[PDB]
Structure formats: C-alpha cells, structure tokens
Write a protein that binds this ligand. Sequence first.
Ligand SMILES: [Mg+2]
Ligand SMILES: [Mg+2]
Ligand SMILES: [Mg+2]
Ligand SMILES: [Mg+2]
Ligand SMILES: [Zn+2]
Ligand SMILES: [Zn+2]
Ligand SMILES: [Zn+2]
Length: 142
Amino acid sequence: KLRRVRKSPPEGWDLIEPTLEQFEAKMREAETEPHEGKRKTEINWPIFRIHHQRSRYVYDMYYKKAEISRELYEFCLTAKFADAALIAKWKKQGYENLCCVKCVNTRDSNFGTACICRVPKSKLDAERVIECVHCGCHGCSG
RNA sequence: GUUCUUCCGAGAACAUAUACUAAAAUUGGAACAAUACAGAGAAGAUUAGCAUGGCCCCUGCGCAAGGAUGACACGCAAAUUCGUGAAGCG
Ligand SMILES: [Mg+2]
Ligand SMILES: [Mg+2]
Ligand SMILES: [Mg+2]
Ligand SMILES: [Mg+2]
Ligand SMILES: [Zn+2]
Ligand SMILES: [Zn+2]
Ligand SMILES: [Zn+2]
C-alpha cells in the first residue's frame, strides 16, 4: 500500500499505523480462514466487516476525534486505507451507520428496493431479527 | 443512528422491505474395461464412392467435412372385386 502512494505518510502516521497494521492482520486472516462449516453467504461477511471497521477508524480519527490532520486523513483515502465512497455515505444524514455500499445499491435488488437492513427498526415488526445476505448487518439505519 | 427543538423527556426531519432464502437432507440420469465367441454395403471374388427416408445419433465454429456409404433399409408389398361349366347328391 504505502509503496503505491509515492509520498511519505505526512503527519502523525505513528498515531494510526499500529491500528491500521492490526486491521491488515485481521483482513488477511479473514481471507485465508476455511470456508467450511459456513453458509455460502457467510464467508464474505468478515471482509465487509473489517473493511467497515478500518474505514470507520480513519473516519473517526479525522472527523469525530480530530486527532489526525486533513493531509494525513486524505493520505489514507489516497492509500486506500479507507473507502472514500463509504465515508462519503457516512457524511449523509440517515446513512451515518451504513455497513457497506452494496446495501444501498437499489439497482442490484430484484424489486429495486434498498437492503432490508436499511429499514429503520421502528418500521419493522420490531421483534423480527435480520441478517442481510450482503454482510450480515442486523440493521444500520435507526 | 444523526441535524435540531425545548419545558424537558419527549417531538419534527433524514433513514424504508435483502435473499432460487441451506453450513443442508432428499431424488432421477449418461459412459466405463474385457475372460471367450464369430465378426461388419451391392444377383462368384477384391469391392469402390455418392445419393435417398425418421420418434436415430457423434466429432466439428460450421449451409464445410468426417464417423463402415456413421448405423438402419433388405418382400406375407393384394389396397375399393369376380366369372365359369361337368360330377355327386337331395
Ligand atoms: Mg465403401
Ligand atoms: Mg458422409
Ligand atoms: Mg467413410
Ligand atoms: Mg449415410
Ligand atoms: Zn451491508
Ligand atoms: Zn444489508
Ligand atoms: Zn446494513
């Protein structure tokens, strides 16, 4: 990754490097863990889950905590440490807990609806438990 | 879950219906390798090649071409119907 961004990490990369380096360890384990004893839908879920976490950590450091400068935050977007297109959603009102961009692509669904996990729980038959097939998200709206 | 309201623990807006839903459990359907036998179209033999037909395939990208002429075919073929005189009887 860092080879492919040419400039050096700008300012306080040491604050985020040990955490990002742990997400890398997580992601490689998720790639190589056996697909046996798991649903054909389940095995992809940790990938989307870890990719959500890592993007969320970079995002929270810059926006909520302000512990990294914009140049270091934008560096993480440039170095593909965080998905700019997922962070682009968490800025939108009503999307601030979105699990993955695949769940808001309405075009890919049979009827042109969003994913069911995007329905607010108060609008469900709220005893109902959800695990959406795209990522196992139980509900990510309200 | 977030941006706001305040009399204050509630209210407005944003957000709005994934998935042949199984890690399964059941249930049909093709060709395989070879002991011994007798062995591959045309009025004697060696026998071309190309056609023809249907509820028969295979190889091939194929309206090309190969697969024994790819194999088969291989006869009670009656399918619109009679007409005659002798000789027994009774
Ligand atoms: Mg011949
Ligand atoms: Mg031929
Ligand atoms: Mg031949
Ligand atoms: Mg023939
Ligand atoms: Zn999702
Ligand atoms: Zn979903
Ligand atoms: Zn979701």
